[PDB]
Amino acid sequence: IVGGYTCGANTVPYQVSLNSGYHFCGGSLINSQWVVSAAHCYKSGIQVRLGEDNINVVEGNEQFISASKSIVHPSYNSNTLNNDIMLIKLKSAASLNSRVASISLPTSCASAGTQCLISGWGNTKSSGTSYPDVLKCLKAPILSDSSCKSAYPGQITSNMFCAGYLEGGKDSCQGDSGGPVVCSGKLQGIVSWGSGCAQKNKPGVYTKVCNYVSWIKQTIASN
């Protein structure tokens, strides 16, 4: 997160860290045994880390649970990043409380101008590299489809939306991938991609979760 603020310990209780010896992607807990992330975060041997604030210090609220199954969207295209969404099933159910909680899936697609909360442990600099140990937060609006397509000609599908600031300075970044975009208490986006971080006229691009609710529910009900 570039240009954000320190969330505070366990203020984002649905935020998860994906760990394969090290943090490499974020995700969102959608019920006691399933996590949603980005398909481009896929790898084998994932451990899901819940209740994290400082990912380098055991602080007392963590739950470490290995993944038993990963399901990349059947139509994921790594060349275009279309359908950049993935489901992860935990080997055992997490213990839910005030500091570890699931986030609700949307019943409708959010509109441009809606203010959302984006979070992650990603890079905090636009020209440089500095990774934080504690969770960072960013409030950003959803941008209109026309401004999104004008910023990324020929690259925005119906499964993507832009959020952020066209003036730059505030954006998600590498290491935030897979993390949540929450608007009005519902998961509306997944950190997907962008050209650099926090660059002028290059806002962040996010997976449009509302298009995948039926696939998520059907998959969870059968796995």
Catalytic site positions: 40, 84, 177
In which residue are the tokens 């279309």 written?
82
Residue with smaller CB distance to Ca ion, 25 or 198: 25
Residue with smaller CB distance to Ca ion, 37 or 63: 63
Q: Please report, in range form, the residues annotated as the binding site for Ca(2+).
A: 52, 54, 57, 62
Cβ 59 to Ca ion shortest distance, Å: 5
CB atoms within 10 A of CB 175: 22
Pure H helices in the chain: 145-151, 213-222
Cβ 171 to Ca ion shortest distance, Å: 25
**Residues 198, 127 contacting (CB under 8 angstroms):** no
Residue with smaller CB distance to Ca ion, 52 or 171: 52
Cβ 111 to Ca ion shortest distance, Å: 36
Q: Please report, in range form, the residues annotated as the binding site for substrate.
A: 171-172, 174-175, 177
Q: Can you say how many angstroms the Cα of residue 151 is from the centroid of all Cα atoms in its chain? A: 21
Q: Can you say how many angstroms the Cα of residue 111 is from the centroid of all Cα atoms in its chain? A: 18
**Residues 130, 175 contacting (CB under 8 angstroms):** no
Residue with smaller CB distance to Ca ion, 19 or 28: 19
Q: Which amino acid is at 3?
A: G
Cβ 82 to Ca ion shortest distance, Å: 34
Rg, Å, the chain Cα set? 16
Give the residue before each break in the chain, using a C-to-N cut-off of over 2.5 angstroms; say none if it is continuous. none
Q: Please report, in range form, the residues annotated as the binding site.
A: 52, 54, 57, 62, 171-172, 174-175, 177
Residues 39-68 that bind Ca ion (CB under 5 A): 52, 54, 59
**Pair of tokens at residue 86:** 């993935």
Residues in touch with Ca ion (CB under 5 A): 52, 54, 59
